[PDB]
């Protein structure tokens, strides 16, 4: 690793600087270096890791969607043949996206998940594993597409099982996991009813637990609850 010679604390410091500078590729490289030091991550460090890769892959996904849309329009009736370039460039972006997903999944498998014993860390990493398999599923078309989808489902399901046993219904990680697994059901697994049921049950169980929270925790939980409601409004 090109970060092997830099101190763990310096990598974390530079990840925070990269975030301030909106240099998310650098941020992700610094956090990958920090993970590869082999020590477990604190809550703030897990956040830095997730923010960095979410921004990198988010940009790739947006670009892939633009290119896929152009490619699909080129394959409609009456469209002038323009050669292999659109497919080639969509494939280039797709391959880079897959590489980033494989990198994140590799960090989770070697060895973040296996050392994560507390609910907050383990649920967080399993949510990430589901998310990055979900991004692989968005672009998948081959023999392994069903296995990629089931890998996302399996990671999300293990995270859900732990979160329901070990976290309150307002815990922001539990809420964000449910939000994303609901989107998985709607956009990946062709299961809109399950998506809607999960979002509604999650929202209602969080609502009933808000009374236990401080003002600051209430703000965190209600923010994610509003995203659940936003999706429900989009879907109904």
């Amino acid at each position: 690793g090109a970060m092997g010679s830099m101190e763990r604390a310096s990598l974390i410091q530079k990840a925070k600087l990269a975030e301030q500078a909106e240099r998310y590729e650098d941020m992700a490289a610094f956090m990958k270096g920090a993970v590869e030091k082999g020590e477990e991550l604190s809550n703030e460090e897990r956040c830095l890791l997730s923010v960095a890769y979410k921004n990198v892959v988010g940009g790739q996904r947006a670009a892939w969607r633009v290119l896929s849309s152009i490619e699909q329009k080129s394959n409609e009736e009456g469209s002038e043949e323009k050669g292999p370039e659109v497919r080639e460039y969509r494939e280039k972006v797709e391959t880079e996206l897959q590489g980033v997903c494989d990198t994140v999944l590799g960090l989770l498998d070697s060895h973040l998940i296996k050392e994560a014993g507390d609910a907050e860390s383990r649920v967080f990493y399993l949510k990430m594993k589901g998310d990055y398999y979900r991004y692989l599923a968005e672009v998948a078309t081959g023999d392994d597409k069903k296995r990629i989808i089931d890998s996302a489902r399996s990671a999300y399901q293990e995270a859900m099982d732990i979160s329901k046993k070990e976290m309150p219904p307002t815990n922001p990680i539990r809420l964000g996991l449910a939000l994303n697994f609901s989107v998985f059901h709607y956009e990946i697994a062709n299961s809109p009813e399950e998506a809607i049921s999960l979002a509604k049950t999650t929202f209602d169980e969080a609502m009933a637990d808000l009374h236990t929270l401080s003002e600051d925790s209430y703000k965190d939980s209600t923010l994610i609850m509003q995203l659940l409601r936003d999706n429900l409004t989009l879907w109904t």
Binding site: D131, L179, N180, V183, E187, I224, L227, D230, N231, W235
Partner: peptide, 5 residues
Amino acid sequence: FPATV
């Protein structure tokens, strides 16, 4: 697209 975090 729907919201994810």
